[PDB]
Amino acid sequence: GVQVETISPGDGRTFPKRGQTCVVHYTGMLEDGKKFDSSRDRNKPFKFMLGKQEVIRGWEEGVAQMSVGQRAKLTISPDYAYGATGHPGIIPPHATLVFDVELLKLE
Amino acid sequence: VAILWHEMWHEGLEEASRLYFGERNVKGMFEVLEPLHAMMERGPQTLKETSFNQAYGRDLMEAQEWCRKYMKSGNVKDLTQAWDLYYHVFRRIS
Numbered sequence: 001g002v003q004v005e006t007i008s009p010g011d012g013r014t015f016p017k018r019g020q021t022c023v024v025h026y027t028g029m030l031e032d033g034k035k036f037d038s039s040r041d042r043n044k045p046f047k048f049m050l051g052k053q054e055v056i057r058g059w060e061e062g063v064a065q066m067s068v069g070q071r072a073k074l075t076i077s078p079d080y081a082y083g084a085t086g087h088p089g090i091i092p093p094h095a096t097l098v099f100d101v102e103l104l105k106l107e
Numbered sequence: 108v109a110i111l112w113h114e115m116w117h118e119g120l121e122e123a124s125r126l127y128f129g130e131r132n133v134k135g136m137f138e139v140l141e142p143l144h145a146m147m148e149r150g151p152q153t154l155k156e157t158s159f160n161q162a163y164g165r166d167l168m169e170a171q172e173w174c175r176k177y178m179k180s181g182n183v184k185d186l187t188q189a190w191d192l193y194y195h196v197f198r199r200i201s
């Protein structure tokens with residue numbers, strides 16, 4: 001559902017636990033590299049909580065495998081992203097999404 | 108009915124975002140959001156409403172503007188500029 005390739009290694013021991021807020025910096029792109037969003041651009045980290053279903057499944061499973069400090073490439077199948085619906089005017093239907101996500105800290 | 112502006116908004120913005128992001132229903136989002144902004148228009152009559160207003164008064168007003176921009180342009184991007192601010196207020200409120 002979600003592939004996870006490492007760009008930069010993390011400390012390999014600090015994995016997010018449920019109810020924790022992952023502070024991150026991401027850049028989401030469509031299969032072909034087309035950027036549709038990025039926190040780095042806004043220069044404001046992104047925070048959210050795991051297991052609360054706040055974010056799509058690809059991220060829920062994907063980020064859960066990342067340790068603090070790690071930066072990875074997440075390739076999410078439409079099943080774990082926006083399905084046949086996609087997101088009107090932003091994400092098309094059956095879109096595979098690619099996110100460049102860096103797990104900065106846990107609070 | 109007695110409810111603090113803080114709770115009225117935390118709860119409202121959550122319902123609004125669910126209908127739009129979760130159900131793709133831009134319609135139910137405005138139905139929920141609308142009355143909230145209208146009340147603000149009426150002005151604060153208590154110390155807590157006033158301070159809540161001094162804190163997030165502007166942000167909310169701008170977000171409501173970005174929604175109006177959307178109503179006129181049909182650009183899903185103007186609608187998201189609003190949600191960037193609603194998120195912001197929502198975060199601080201929790």
Ligand SMILES: CO[C@@H]1C[C@H](C[C@@H](C)[C@@H]2CC(=O)[C@H](C)/C=C(\C)[C@@H](O)[C@@H](OC)C(=O)[C@H](C)C[C@H](C)/C=C/C=C/C=C(\C)[C@@H](c3ccc(C)s3)C[C@@H]3CC[C@@H](C)[C@@](O)(O3)C(=O)C(=O)N3CCCC[C@H]3C(=O)O2)CC[C@H]1O
Binds near residue numbers: 056090124128194197
């Ligand atoms: C209701 O179902 C859930 C909906 C959710 C929807 C996608 C779009 C999420 C959106 C979010 O990350 C935000 C934080 C959360 C929600 C909207 C909901 O979970 C909501 O439900 C109770 C909730 O808890 C929040 C806290 C309520 C609060 C009042 C509203 C916050 C709104 C925030 C909006 C933000 C950050 C948007 C802006 C970013 C830049 C701007 C400018 S606007 C994000 C946008 C929306 C559109 C998409 C293409 C994208 O570009 O991100 C994006 O890159 C994306 O796909 N994201 C956001 C980054 C993390 C991964 C993914 C995602 O899961 O987003 C997916 C999972 C479902 O379980």
